[PDB]
Amino acid sequence: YAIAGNGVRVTYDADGQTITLYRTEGSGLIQMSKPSPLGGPVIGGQEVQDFSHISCDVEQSTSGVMGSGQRMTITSQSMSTGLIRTYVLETSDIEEGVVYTATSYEAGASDVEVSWFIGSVYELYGAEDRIWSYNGGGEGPMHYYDTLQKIDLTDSGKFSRENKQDDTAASIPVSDIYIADGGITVGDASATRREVHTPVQETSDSAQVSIGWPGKVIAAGSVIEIGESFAVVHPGDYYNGLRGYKNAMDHLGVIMPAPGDIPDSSYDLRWESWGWGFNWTIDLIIGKLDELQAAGVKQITLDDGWYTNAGDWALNPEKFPNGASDALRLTDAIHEHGMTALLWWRPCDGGIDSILYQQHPEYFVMDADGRPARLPTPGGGTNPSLGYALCPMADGAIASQVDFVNRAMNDWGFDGFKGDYVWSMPECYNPAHNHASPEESTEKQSEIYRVSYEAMVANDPNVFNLLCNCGTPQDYYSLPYMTQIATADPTSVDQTRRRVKAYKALMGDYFPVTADHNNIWYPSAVGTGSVLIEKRDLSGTAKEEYEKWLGIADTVQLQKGRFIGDLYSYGFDPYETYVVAADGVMYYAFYKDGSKYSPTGYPDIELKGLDPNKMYRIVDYVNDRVVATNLMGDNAVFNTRFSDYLLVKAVEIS
Numbered sequence: 001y002a003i004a005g006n007g008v009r010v011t012y013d014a015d016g017q018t019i020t021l022y023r024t025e026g027s028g029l030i031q032m033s034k035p036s037p038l039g040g041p042v043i044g045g046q047e048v049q050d051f052s053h054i055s056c057d058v059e060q061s062t063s064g065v066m067g068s069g070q071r072m073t074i075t076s077q078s079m080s081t082g083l084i085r086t087y088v089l090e091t092s093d094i095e096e097g098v099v100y101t102a103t104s105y106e107a108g109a110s111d112v113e114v115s116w117f118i119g120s121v122y123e124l125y126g127a128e129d130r131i132w133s134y135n136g137g138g139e140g141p142m143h144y145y146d147t148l149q150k151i152d153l154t155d156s157g158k159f160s161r162e163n164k165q166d167d168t169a170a171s172i173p174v175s176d177i178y179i180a181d182g183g184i185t186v187g188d189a190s191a192t193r194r195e196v197h198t199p200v201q202e203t204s205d206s207a208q209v210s211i212g213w214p215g216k217v218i219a220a221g222s223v224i225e226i227g228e229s230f231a232v233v234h235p236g237d238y239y240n241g242l243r244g245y246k247n248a249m250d251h252l253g254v255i256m257p258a259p260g261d262i263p264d265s266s267y268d269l270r271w272e273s274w275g276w277g278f279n280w281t282i283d284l285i286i287g288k289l290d291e292l293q294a295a296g297v298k299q300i301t302l303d304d305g306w307y308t309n310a311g312d313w314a315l316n317p318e319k320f321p322n323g324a325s326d327a328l329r330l331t332d333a334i335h336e337h338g339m340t341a342l343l344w345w346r347p348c349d350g351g352i353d354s355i356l357y358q359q360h361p362e363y364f365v366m367d368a369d370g371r372p373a374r375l376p377t378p379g380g381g382t383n384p385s386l387g388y389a390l391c392p393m394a395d396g397a398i399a400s401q402v403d404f405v406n407r408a409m410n411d412w413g414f415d416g417f418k419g420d421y422v423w424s425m426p427e428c429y430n431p432a433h434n435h436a437s438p439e440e441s442t443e444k445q446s447e448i449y450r451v452s453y454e455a456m457v458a459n460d461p462n463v464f465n466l467l468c469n470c471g472t473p474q475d476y477y478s479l480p481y482m483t484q485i486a487t488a489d490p491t492s493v494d495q496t497r498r499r500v501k502a503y504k505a506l507m508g509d510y511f512p513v514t515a516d517h518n519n520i521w522y523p524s525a526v527g528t529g530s531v532l533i534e535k536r537d538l539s540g541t542a543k544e545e546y547e548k549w550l551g552i553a554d555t556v557q558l559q560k561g562r563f564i565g566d567l568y569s570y571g572f573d574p575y576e577t578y579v580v581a582a583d584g585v586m587y588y589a590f591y592k593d594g595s596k597y598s599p600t601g602y603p604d605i606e607l608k609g610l611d612p613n614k615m616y617r618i619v620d621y622v623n624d625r626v627v628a629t630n631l632m633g634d635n636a637v638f639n640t641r642f643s644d645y646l647l648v649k650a651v652e653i654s
């Protein structure tokens with residue numbers, strides 16, 4: 001029993017009750033997965049494994065979620081529970097590497113109580129000493145837990161992570177595991193946010209990636225659908241898997257912005273006031289504008305500390321003693337230096353001591369005990385700066401967000417927004433909201449982001465919009481409404497660079513990403529094809545260093561180039577490597593300063609993706625020196641010494 005799709009083969013063994021995944025390479029298949037068991041319900045703390053094969057049906061010419069392709073339908077039965085399971089797999093003639101899966105269960109004579117449903121599990125075939133993993137969960141830890149994680153098979157430890165999306169976790173419902181020969185991505189196939197896990201677990205000699213959803217009581221003689229997923233077999237690293245997921249999710253209407261519609265100002269070099277913390281003033285910001293303009297900056301953020309309270313989002317009298325005319329004086333001055341102006345806010349937060357909470361508590365989320373619910377930190381808990389959550393289904397809550405947008409753009413003259421410092425959305429029990437279930441608030445969080453953005457666009461189609469779920473992967477269902485992504489308070493060069501690759505995969509190769517400004521890492525920002533940003537008030541040699549790198553970034557402009565993620569594999573090619581094509585020229589960046597993956601010794605550098613018949617001169621564009629005078633495209637290999645980074649371009653020579 002087998003079905004085929006572009007780039008993928010799926011086989012079922014009825015004796016085994018197992019599934020094996022294959023990927024096409026050249027003229028032959030490569031086996032991506034070990035034979036893997038079908039996902040089952042969990043009852044009384046145990047997954048049910050009494051299921052027996054009933055039938056397998058294969059259709060060769062059919063049309064499914066992804067359009068025309070193939071389908072395999074497997075029916076199984078459990079005598080102890082009375083459950084009949086229907087497991088459907090679909091492939092696509094067009095979409096590369098992708099398998100769609102859906103599961104339903106039918107109960108017999110008695111009700112079945114299920115705590116959790118496991119959808120699909122794939123254990124990787126052919127692993128040796130290490131497996132690399134992409135982990136999209138929103139449960140934290142914040143900031144200091146890497147999104148990309150090495151699973152070492154030679155050590156004492158056993159890697160295990162749930163990768164949650166729930167009332168305390170709002171990130172990306174995807175996980176990937178990969179080796180030199182490639183990997184398997186699993187992601188939630190839903191147009192809207194729902195509770196799901198994508199666990200990654202080390203096994204005895206490998207690792208497995210899976211997906212699962214919350215249980216329910218299944219009534220006697222009833223049929224219910226429990227969950228649907230996308231799997232992607234791929235060569236290379238997590239970029240290829242995540243790109244597959246992006247392509248799949250288009251079919252469900254989750255479509256990221258096309259290059260032609262992204263505004264010019266969302267590719268601009270930016271300086272933010274956060275360097276001064278809460279002690280910025282209008283005149284301090286204005287005083288920097290001449291030097292910022294001359295050095296090449298084209299965008300300014302007014303960061304945190306401008307407002308009275310969240311929800312109200314009114315001007316703080318100490319910062320704006322003359323009211324709205326002071327805000328206009330700031331944005332006018334920014335505009336006079338040829339720049340756009342952005343404003344910091346925290347969407348979903350209606351404050352605690354706000355006028356909004358005092359006058360309209362009915363707009364807010366209510367907990368099970370009848371108290372106002374605080375916005376959660378990742379994994380649960382709260383933060384003193386986080387206020388009460390606005391309910392996304394209360395019309396007045398949404399209106400408060402829209403009114404803020406209209407005031408900031410039309411009364412104060414701002415050109416865009418930096419959303420920040422917010423994560424998931426608590427469950428709502430307010431009976432006056434008439435919720436279908438308490439999770440409905442969590443599910444509909446992204447409506448705040450959508451309605452806000454639509455209001456922004458109506459004022460100015462070139463408006464800038466960003467959201468930072470700081471220290472975690474960004475809320476996936478916010479992404480359609482963005483013009484730029486930040487790597488989100490990265491705590492290392494490893495974090496910022498690898499996340500650039502992940503976001504490019506999910507959003508498109510021309511989608512704007514910034515490496516952020518938590519630490520000074522100008523070479524990381526340029527070489528990844530990211531937008532270089534800064535927040536500090538600099539002097540002396542550090543000022544010279546910022547000017548230098550503004551000049552380089554403004555010369556090569558790799559933030560506007562086509563990111564290329566399919567040539568090198570993070571953790572398997574000799575160096576951590578990034579590639580961008582700009583104005584018909586290939587730019588490469590090699591790094592050694594990331595402690596998570598860095599070679600012993602001094603391996604040769606290989607330039608991939610050049611024309612085999614052409615000859616190239618290799619130039620270090622930072623230092624303006626030739627590192628290799630003439631390389632053929634089919635054998636572009638050289639050795640050069642560098643301590644942290646090497647940024648080069650391949651110049652065609654006649």
Ligand SMILES: N[C@H]1[C@@H](Oc2ccc([N+](=O)[O-])cc2)O[C@H](CO)[C@H](O)[C@@H]1O
Pocket residue numbers: 274303304344383420421468470488489
């Ligand atoms: N990433 C944001 C963000 O950074 C933080 C700071 C603290 C916390 N926190 O205490 O969870 C989270 C994100 O807010 C800061 C302002 O308060 C700045 O605007 C940064 O650029």
Ligand SMILES: [Cl-]
Pocket residue numbers: 146147148494495496498499
């Ligand atoms: Cl990371």
Ligand SMILES: [Co+2]
Pocket residue numbers: 420421468469470471488489
């Ligand atoms: Co942030």
Ligand SMILES: [Mn+2]
Pocket residue numbers: 151152153154155156157158159202
């Ligand atoms: Mn281990």
Ligand SMILES: [Zn+2]
Pocket residue numbers: 364365366391392393394428429430433435441
């Ligand atoms: Zn509500």
